[PDB]
Design a protein around this ligand. Structure first.
Ligand SMILES: C[C@@H]1O[C@@H](O[C@@H]2[C@@H](O[C@H]3O[C@H](CO)[C@H](O)[C@H](O)[C@H]3O)[C@@H](O)[C@@H](CO)O[C@@H]2O)[C@@H](O)[C@H](O)[C@@H]1O
Ligand SMILES: C[C@@H]1O[C@@H](O[C@@H]2[C@@H](O[C@H]3O[C@H](CO)[C@H](O)[C@H](O)[C@H]3O)[C@@H](O)[C@@H](CO)O[C@@H]2O)[C@@H](O)[C@H](O)[C@@H]1O
Ligand SMILES: C[C@@H]1O[C@@H](O[C@@H]2[C@@H](O[C@H]3O[C@H](CO)[C@H](O)[C@H](O)[C@H]3O)[C@@H](O)[C@@H](CO)O[C@@H]2O)[C@@H](O)[C@H](O)[C@@H]1O
Ligand SMILES: C[C@@H]1O[C@@H](O[C@@H]2[C@@H](O[C@H]3O[C@H](CO)[C@H](O)[C@H](O)[C@H]3O)[C@@H](O)[C@@H](CO)O[C@@H]2O)[C@@H](O)[C@H](O)[C@@H]1O
Ligand SMILES: C[C@@H]1O[C@@H](O[C@@H]2[C@@H](O[C@H]3O[C@H](CO)[C@H](O)[C@H](O)[C@H]3O)[C@@H](O)[C@@H](CO)O[C@H]2O)[C@@H](O)[C@H](O)[C@@H]1O
Ligand SMILES: C[C@@H]1O[C@@H](O[C@@H]2[C@@H](O[C@H]3O[C@H](CO)[C@H](O)[C@H](O)[C@H]3O)[C@@H](O)[C@@H](CO)O[C@H]2O)[C@@H](O)[C@H](O)[C@@H]1O
Ligand code: CA
Ligand code: CA
Ligand code: CA
Ligand code: CA
Ligand code: MN
Ligand code: MN
Ligand code: NA
Ligand code: NA
Lengths: 292, 292
């Protein structure tokens, strides 16, 4: 089954993602095919899949930016029926906004079926143009038709996945304790993580003994990523990944506070130095505490 | 011995505090007697006492606001010699800026002796006027003269003192771990703690599932108090007290993130709810983790 989380949904035939046009919150905003840039935030192209309890493999799909839901217009089963953003709720009973999502016949891409109509999300004609129509269309679960096949490129980690990335790391102290704050996290590209650091004003901050030292930099960076999350996205039910760690050096006679993020493959953590914006695989300390 | 820390230094005879006039960083800024308001930040009247290693009961006194040092003008032993703010360093060898501070004959107030001159800090004539001269003056360690007696009203806690206040509290979970970030903390009046909360913009923030929920409010409040410390004070070598706690309810089926501060007497903690600005002796959770 597709896991709860945030997805960049990319057509299997052409490099077009499912895009809520101009990120508009208006009811009936077209959802279209649009080109995308890897290792960026694709602002109009992120979808929070929320599993419906007791209805197998069936989800709402909420646009992270707009906070509006992928909606089959009037739930029509006619081929070519508009797929739009529409106001709704994460556990709606409105079948216009319920989507059964299961693996295609290629075992890697998915098909997206409207729960009400039993028609499929279709990039009409496989058109690769920016703003190409996406519609509900007749189809089958088993057929090869790439118009109706969608890679769910996973952009978020569970707290369990983040816990596993930390536990893999070779710089964890024997006394380590980790404190988990949320359930599902958007993983940022380093380019975005860096931009939030810059926009916080931290690059201008001076180290001062106790009054603005390592712990102040690390906590300011976590607060800044928190603020950016709330200020940037209209959807609820996820957080932004940014960790704080306290570490101790090999000699056991010096400690340091810093941040950490996750690799592109979500398998490992990377240390971030909020005093200079560096990324490091080894920051010269082993973590004895994290909160994220 | 006087402990390292931040002091409001109040004359034993009249209610005048040692005040760096207009908080000016200029060399030769007069240090004067001035009236004060209890349970406020007295912005020009806070002094960081830094013990000199291997010189018994002898300190620098750094004005928290200006970052300049209490200085006996040209180290003169003549009665009536000016006491001013002057540029210096926490462990200076300049005897103009070194002060032997020991209990008076009343066992409660201190006398402040210049290490070089062996003359005492004197509120000239016991004048209670705002802007009354303070000078180096002839005296003895044992005499009752209240012109030369000073209550060192302690405004800061050590990390040890903060650890003891938490451990007293009846709402600490059996699994509690505390993570200490600094060494010496200015304790805020609730009136100031509240003002920093207001000035952060947190009173306007909405609770949103995961994306701005309890942990975001608590960490935003700690970041805001950190920022306020660095932006407000020019001295180094202390921090501002503001804790984050994670707690669990009695049933063990709900958790919450919040802040805590310290009572006026520095003996106990008080919980702060950053979602509404409330202070509570019981927030309905027992802490399993703190960082401060
Ligand atoms: C059958 C129909 O279902 C609901 O209407 C839907 C629309 O529903 C969604 O938007 C409306 C406001 O337009 C409302 O907020 C509702 O809670 C939300 O789920 C929407 O799916 C459109 C576009 O496909 O179709 C229908 O108009 C309901 O509001 C109607 O009363 C009616 O029962
Ligand atoms: C290239 C083309 O692929 C297939 O046609 C698709 C359409 O496919 C879907 O709809 C048709 C009926 O219109 C049928 O129900 C099929 O099972 C279903 O997958 C559809 O994707 C449209 C809109 O994008 O494009 C093409 O017409 C195939 O059926 C055709 O023979 C042809 O090979
Ligand atoms: C004996 C004298 O000591 C120092 O001068 C002090 C002053 O010292 C302080 O301020 C000066 C700059 O004016 C400098 O920054 C120094 O490091 C600092 O400790 C000051 O205490 C004044 C007022 O009482 O008296 C003397 O001028 C030193 O700089 C001189 O060279 C000289 O050795
Ligand atoms: C009321 C007054 O108190 C004392 O005099 C103080 C001064 O006291 C200090 O200086 C004198 C010499 O001027 C002497 O060395 C004394 O031991 C020392 O404490 C001084 O505080 C000034 C400036 O504020 O005010 C008074 O003159 C006492 O000696 C007087 O007899 C008289 O009772
Ligand atoms: C917020 C906005 O994002 C970008 O524009 C979007 C656009 O973004 C996608 O397509 C562009 C090329 O047009 C790039 O491939 C991006 O990497 C994609 O994410 C689309 O989402 C359309 C349709 O909804 O809306 C635009 O606003 C960017 O070009 C803008 O400067 C701006 O940052
Ligand atoms: C920063 C400034 O603080 C206050 O003025 C100070 C003044 O403060 C003390 O004296 C006033 C009465 O003049 C009150 O008792 C305060 O509680 C004291 O802290 C002195 O420090 C003088 C001399 O250095 O400087 C003034 O700036 C306050 O009145 C101002 O509004 C302002 O907040
Ligand atoms: Ca949370
Ligand atoms: Ca600090
Ligand atoms: Ca520190
Ligand atoms: Ca959160
Ligand atoms: Mn290591
Ligand atoms: Mn309790
Ligand atoms: Na389900
Ligand atoms: Na000493």
């Amino acid at each position: 089954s597709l896991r709860r989380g945030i997805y960049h949904i990319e057509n299997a035939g052409v490099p077009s993602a499912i895009d809520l046009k101009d990120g508009s919150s208006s009811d009936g905003t077209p959802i279209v095919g649009w080109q995308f840039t890897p290792d960026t935030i694709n602002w109009h192209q992120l979808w929070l899949a929320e599993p419906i309890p007791n209805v197998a493999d069936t989800f709402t799909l909420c646009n992270l930016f707009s906070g509006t839901y992928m909606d089959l217009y009037n739930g029509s089963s006619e081929a070519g029926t508009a797929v739009n953003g529409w106001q709704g709720t994460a556990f709606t009973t409105n079948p216009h906004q319920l989507w059964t999502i299961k693996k295609s016949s290629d075992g890697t891409s998915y098909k997206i079926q409207n729960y009400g109509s039993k028609t499929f999300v279709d990039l009409v004609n496989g058109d690769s143009s920016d703003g190409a129509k996406i519609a509900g269309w007749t189809g089958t679960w088993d057929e090869g038709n790439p118009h109706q096949k969608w890679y769910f490129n996973r952009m978020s980690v569970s707290s369990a996945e983040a816990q596993a990335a930390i536990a893999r790391n070779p710089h964890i102290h024997g006394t380590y304790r980790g404190y988990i704050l949320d359930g599902e996290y958007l993983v940022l590209p380093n380019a975005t993580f860096t931009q939030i650091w810059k926009d916080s004003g931290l690059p201008g901050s001076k180290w001062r003994e106790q009054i603005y030292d390592c712990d102040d930099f690390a906590i300011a960076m976590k607060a800044a990523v928190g603020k950016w999350g709330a200020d940037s996205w209209k959807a609820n039910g996820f957080a932004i990944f940014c960790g704080v760690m306290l570490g101790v050096n090999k000699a056991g006679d010096a400690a340091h506070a810093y941040n950490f993020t996750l690799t592109k493959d979500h398998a490992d953590i990377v240390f971030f130095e909020p005093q200079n914006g560096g990324y490091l695989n080894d920051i010269g300390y082993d973590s004895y505490m994290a909160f994220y």
